[PDB]
Symmetry: C2
């Protein structure tokens, strides 16, 4: 009954990592991105002290922090600069990264308008409203949808995108963004929606939670998640945002999406009565895993990596290992002899992103699949003696290594299979099972943006990515098609004709360098040529001429019309078999500052 | 493919209404429960002014408020009095009312332990943390799970009850508690759980939202939801809490549950791009409804009441009517209908997180009593409703809720719908159908003597106001025997009529023919009587010989009696009885 769900687009920003590319670079190099708290959030020295004896003090001076928490492009999203000050950074990052995941997928907003697409995002209050009260700012009407009601974040994006599926904040603490994946997939099975965006956003805006969580005994006095280590003594807090776009696998394959991985099963439960309210329950976790792998109907011996919840608490890590061991044993009781499974945790790299913890874990795994590499889990040179992995399928990933394929009883290599766990301190558990996805002539390369500065930015992004050779000449039509049908058509336009990445690169540089134009690329503004658009759209004879130009591949001519805002049916440029959509740079939003006024 | 879900237990507290009984009394009488803001919340005069011109001021001095917002019995839930101060009233009310909904159903905690039961509750921050942040109270470790993370409310109850199903806060603004029902019903269909508890909790603890929402243009300057009226000009804020226990209809019938009504379909959607972010979308509401009723596979002409979202906005009320008309028209097309419409907000205000659950409970009671109650303040209808050429009329006066009959001459179960729409655009709709169906030992227990006396008075009072007959006696007995946790302070009496029961209860309450004991003080007797096969035979013989006074005597001393064996294969049906009378101790922000 369960229909597999494709992951067709992703986006994110993490401690030390501006985007998904840098994130992988950091993970591959074993980089630790935890820092001391930045002065622009609060002064850690001012609140420093012994949390067990000193009023409102903490010894926790560390966190994983992201750049740009206050950056937003409100006009892009139809919000005024004045309104923007009132809008919670939780919402602003939500809107920004949802759009980026859509652009990553190559899914145009026009394609999404009117659909039952769902949105499920781990989000909640993180102190923006408190920053208002501290500055003794008056209470205004804007505050209500701006920063008083967390559901407004997802709801504002559904409004903007004109989509009709469920639109919800998800808050189950540490497990939120993985429960959101569960809820999204579940929604896709029962017809609540057809496609969904899911993810999480976590921001650390005041010292209050550091202080309170410090006093509750949750945080490491060394400021590191030393997951699996004998020295594990709490977690370190982090900020971040991650988003995935989800489509039924059938649809994704049919529509030509690119596919990061396939969700084969999910589960959510609660730990029930544990030792204390905040103690994880190894029996609940085992049962969770069992449910997920039964749904996926995959053999436990083919699962070769697990992204643990792995917060680096002294008691939690072994409990998690014990849950895994019980689960795999029960599943074995009811394919690949010598079962070996790596275990690691992105928390060791960027800390515990709380609301965005689960999505950060899924993205690490997707990248690990893309690059057939298991990256190093940090700070665990000396393993916690309670793990006892020797007589089991499991090992901790203590060094970067190839993620090797496994092969069935017959001769054929199997897709890499992995699981991701996320557990909330209140007892809400989630697990997700992922499987690796197993798959001249000129064209018109088009770009558009809201204004000239953003258009130059888009050009640079594309330029930079061609130069660091992420693409080759075999990709050119995939690039062209994605840009043609997989991007919103905005007002400021650039088009050039190219048959090679080199020819493309050259024309892009020309537009970027200057100026520097001599009729080699095309430029226009949609709003400045109306009545020509009407002519080519509401007149049957001009439409037929336009169709002929496309069929005859008059590229230079079509480019000239497109930059002027004339609607071109690019599909007619291709046979029945369309080029597969491809991951390209997403919108370079203005980095404008909005904060408490 | 859709499996119908039974509502088998309910609980709640609303403005002007301490419990469900009083809530119905208020509704039947057409009572308006909105008042001025109580001084113990804030002083409205202090924040009074013109919201359009005056900084930090509002002209909104009304709300629907409940009693006991600060009241909690923490030792019941294994929480210390000291920790209790840090626990958000959102969570305290959640725990309190989830337990009452379980007891209403006649479901013992022992029965739930280890099960995959879910909890889905509309809840969120409502200012408790802000009351700390103001009085510059020190930040403590207790604050983290106490009032910083709203998911801890449902999670703490899953912990307490030892249940393993999904446990979640639901926050979609105004639609939250109805979306919670959708999510629970959906979870029960896909195996995320077997049974579920769903509901909503809304508390109004500071003036901040009154001020912001006032300035946003959301609130009536008269302080009333005048839903459907020509004077409709915004809503009035209310507090409240309501809970339902949900079981698959198959299971409920099989297990002998009593059933308030049956959910035949649900739906949730988003309005997408509307005129503004906060504008409702009649086309989205129409598609919502169409989906719910298609799922329910019921003919539209059999639906005879709709509980509208009905906030009493000038533009929203007609928009809702237009969505309804379009939906039913579309439903007729893919195949003398008369359908009433009302809104409980006219009675108690907009309960926000608990608005949806309030509307459902009104409908359940309307069903119980075969009555459509008056929707208030709508003597003069909004001229934009345009109801004349349609099945709909506004319920402007109390009236019988009449059955309608099919073509084969047969009576139909009453069918109703409930809508709840969030200001961010999240819509939910739920379709409900009316459910069509010698002595014993009466036992009571509580955590202490005071709570036991409370339980006895509750039972006395409900017998005196004639809620039961002699025909119910074995249902009462059975429910109390198997549908209540066995707590330490115990009372039992033998009775063959309500009269005799009433007499014996009055005797115990007065201070005076009944049995009384404490389980923890009779480990000696428990030793004598426990874990032996010949003792078992003896107990089986006492039951067979109906030696009730003797069994009652042992039971109050903490001996296990197999009460099930007093009955044949078909047990009496569980019945709704008063739920635990929690201690009304005050817990709040610490000095």
């Amino acid at each position: 009954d369960f229909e597999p769900v494709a992951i067709v687009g992703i986006s994110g920003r993490f401690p030390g990592a501006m985007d998904i590319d840098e994130f992988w670079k950091n993970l591959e190099e074993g980089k630790d991105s935890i820092t001391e708290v930045p002065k622009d959030r609060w002064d850690w020295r001012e609140h420093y002290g012994n949390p067990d004896t000193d009023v409102n003090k903490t010894d926790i001076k560390w966190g994983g922090f992201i750049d740009g928490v206050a950056e937003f492009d409100p006009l892009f999203f139809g919000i005024s600069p004045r309104e923007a000050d009132y809008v919670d950074p939780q919402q602003r990052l939500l809107m920004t990264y949802v759009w980026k995941a859509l652009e990553d997928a190559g899914c145009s907003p026009q394609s999404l308008s009117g659909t039952g697409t769902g949105i499920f995002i781990g989000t909640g209050n993180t102190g923006y409203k408190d920053l208002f009260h501290r500055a003794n700012l008056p209470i205004e009407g804007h505050a209500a949808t701006g920063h008083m009601i967390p559901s407004v974040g997802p709801n504002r994006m559904s409004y903007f995108l004109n989509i009709h599926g469920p639109s919800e904040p998800v808050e189950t603490a540490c497990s939120s963004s993985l429960v959101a994946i569960h809820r999204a997939v579940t929604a896709m099975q029962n017809g609540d929606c057809e496609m969904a965006i899911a993810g999480g956003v976590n921001t650390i805006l005041t010292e209050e939670a550091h202080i309170s969580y410090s006093k509750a005994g949750m945080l490491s006095t060394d400021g590191r998640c030393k997951t699996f280590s004998a020295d594990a003594n709490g977690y370190v807090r982090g900020e971040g945002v991650g988003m995935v776009m989800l489509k039924k696998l059938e649809d994704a394959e049919r529509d030509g999406n690119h596919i990061y991985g396939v969700i084969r099963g999910t589960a959510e439960n609660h730990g029930g009565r544990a030792n204390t309210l905040t103690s994880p329950n190894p029996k609940a976790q085992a049962d969770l895993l069992v449910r997920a792998y039964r749904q996926a109907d995959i053999d436990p011996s083919t699962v070769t990596y697990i992204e643990a919840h792995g917060t680096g608490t002294e008691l939690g890590d072994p409990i998690e290992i014990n849950g895994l061991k019980a689960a795999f044993k029960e599943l074995s009781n009811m394919d690949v002899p010598d079962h070996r499974c790596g275990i690691g945790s992105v928390k060791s790299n960027i800390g515990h992103l709380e609301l965005a913890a689960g999505i950060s874990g899924l993205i690490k795994v997707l990248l690990q699949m893309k690059h057939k590499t298991l990256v190093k889990s940090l700070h665990c040179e000396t393993l916690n003696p309670y793990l006892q992995l020797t007589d089991s399928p499991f090992y901790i990933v203590q060094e970067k290594q190839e993620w090797k394929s496994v092969t069935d009883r017959d001769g054929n290599e199997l897709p890499r299979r992995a699981g991701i766990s996320s557990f909330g301190i209140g007892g809400v558990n989630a697990h997700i099972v992922i499987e690796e996805y197993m798959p001249e002539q000129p064209n018109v390369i088009v770009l558009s943006a809201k204004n000239k500065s953003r258009l130059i930015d888009r050009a640079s992004q594309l330029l930079e990515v061609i130069r660091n050779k992420k693409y080759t000449d075999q990709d050119l039509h995939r690039i062209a098609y994605t840009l043609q049908v997989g991007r919103e058509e905005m007002d400021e336009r650039l088009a050039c004709v190219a048959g090679t990445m080199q020819e493309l690169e050259e024309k892009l540089q020309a537009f970027v360098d200057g100026k520097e134009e001599t009729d080699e690329f095309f430029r226009g503004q949609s709003h400045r040529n109306k009545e020509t658009q009407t002519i080519f759209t509401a007149d049957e004879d001009m439409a037929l001429a336009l169709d002929a130009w496309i069929r005859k591949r008059k590229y230079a001519k079509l480019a000239d019309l497109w930059v002027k805002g004339v609607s071109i049916q690019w599909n007619t440029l291709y046979g029945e078999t369309k080029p597969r959509l491809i991951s390209l740079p997403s919108y370079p939003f203005a980095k404008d500052h909005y904060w408490v006024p």
